[PDB]
């Protein structure tokens, strides 16, 4: 089960020149390309090893499209300003995301194309990739623009079509990287509070993909409430970390069980003190 | 491979 995803960001700098624009490309949880308006190359650049093979006609075409994004966002910042009746003194952000998910068999599953203005949803392609979601009258203008231009259809044509082929190309071209599976090197510590309680932190390190589940179960019943859980983070080497943690009454420290689920484990783990 | 449908809003 796989996916390709492009994230795109533009941040306006009123008074201080053109808006900063960064775009980045993912396969599952792996970065394979980037573009930054503020670097020297002004070229789409690679970030995985397996992508560097692609000839000059590849990077050309990407750099061509990425710059087009760039420009659109610039134009889009100014427009959106007007649909909201905003002035020219504030810094504003536009964010676009699109990509396509596959299944075990590498066949099309789901598609998405999402646009967010200032950090809230603006317009997105719905599930069927046939309509649009207007969270505004301002976005209502945009929808009309796109509806008439038949954008859905063409993005559908890309999201179902071109998207899955190249992802097929990518997973293929890097199988020794992308379709790997690193399992949670699972842990567990114990700490004090004030002579009276103690914390059980269920650790999980060095896994890939980043998708994991850490739940806690007291007396065979999960302890939804009263529990601390951090966001998965990157180690910085292609692998992820996470931990969950609970405070248990001193001397019950052994009735508590942590449940670690990840597609890299044959059997979902169970852990106890 | 990125898309070729980039339209203004």
């Amino acid at each position, epitope marked *: 089960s796989h996916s390709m995803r492009y994230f795109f960001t533009s941040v306006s700098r009123p008074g201080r020149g053109e808006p900063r624009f960064i775009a980045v490309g993912y396969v599952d949880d792996t970065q394979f390309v980037r573009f930054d308006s503020d670097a020297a190359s002004q070229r789409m650049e690679p970030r995985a090893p397996w992508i560097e093979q692609e000839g000059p006609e590849y990077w050309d075409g990407e750099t061509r499209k990425v710059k087009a*994004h*760039s*420009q659109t966002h610039r*134009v889009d910042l100014g427009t959106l300003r007007g649909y909201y009746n905003q002035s020219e003194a504030g810094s504003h952000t536009v964010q676009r995301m699109y990509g396509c998910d596959v299944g075990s068999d590498w066949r099309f599953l789901r598609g998405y194309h999402q646009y967010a203005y200032d950090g809230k949803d603006y317009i997105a392609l719905k599930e069927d990739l046939r309509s649009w979601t207007a969270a505004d009258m301002a976005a209502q203008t945009t929808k009309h623009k796109w509806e008439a231009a038949h954008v859905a*259809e063409q993005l559908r044509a890309y999201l179902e079509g071109t998207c899955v082929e190249w992802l097929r190309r990518y997973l293929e071209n890097g199988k020794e990287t992308l379709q790997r599976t690193d399992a949670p090197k699972t842990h567990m510590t114990h700490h004090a509070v004030s002579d009276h309680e103690a914390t059980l932190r269920c650790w999980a390190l060095s896994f890939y993909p980043a998708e994991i589940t850490l739940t806690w179960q007291r007396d065979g019943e999960d302890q939804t409430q009263d529990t601390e859980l951090v966001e998965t983070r990157p180690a910085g080497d292609g692998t992820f970390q996470k931990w969950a943690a609970v405070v248990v009454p001193s001397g019950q420290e052994q009735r508590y069980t942590c449940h670690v689920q990840h597609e890299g484990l044959p059997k979902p783990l169970t852990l106890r003190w | 491979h990125m898309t*070729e449908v980039v339209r203004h809003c």
Partner: T-cell receptor
Amino acid sequence: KEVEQDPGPLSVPEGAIVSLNCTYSNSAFQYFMWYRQYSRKGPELLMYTYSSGNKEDGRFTAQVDKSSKYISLFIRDSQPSDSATYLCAMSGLKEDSSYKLIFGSGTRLLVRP
Amino acid sequence: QVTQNPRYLITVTGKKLTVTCSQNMNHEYMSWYRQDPGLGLRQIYYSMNVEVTDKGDVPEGYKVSRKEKRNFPLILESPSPNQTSLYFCASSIQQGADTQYFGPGTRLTVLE
């Protein structure tokens, strides 16, 4: 970004199914148009597709095939009133985010009555 | 409907002339093409929107402006003989994308 296209003129008798072709090399073309220009007049749209497949406006059939890189127009039931120069055109996203419209040299059709 | 003016025009070499193109369809993209036997249809300049303008395949010897949305003038500072051509203005609702609507054509001859 190049379009080749037989210049003509193709003479055919009324009733003949005409076939007009353009091949292209640019992978990046997204919009594909057939224009009909009648001597000393401004080109006017005839067919438009953004997607592959086959579209139809009665007597008219447009075919795009991104594999062969091959644009086709078929006028079934040729008529005299179809003597024109038929231009094919294709547009591709540019880095300024304009779409550039590149035209084939145009095929002169003369349909005999 | 796109308008050009004038539809014909003769000049000796050297006199600055201008072909004005117009449209109240509320399109934002306008460009100018020339048409010459065998060469086909060549873009000269275009403009994706107001105050926005950019060179085409064949810009040399020509200049434009886009001060107002509804007009895209083509300006020849110093005509050359071989600027003699059929000149079409085309408009597009957005970016140059989808269909492009053509002017009825300006025929131009620049004489020795």
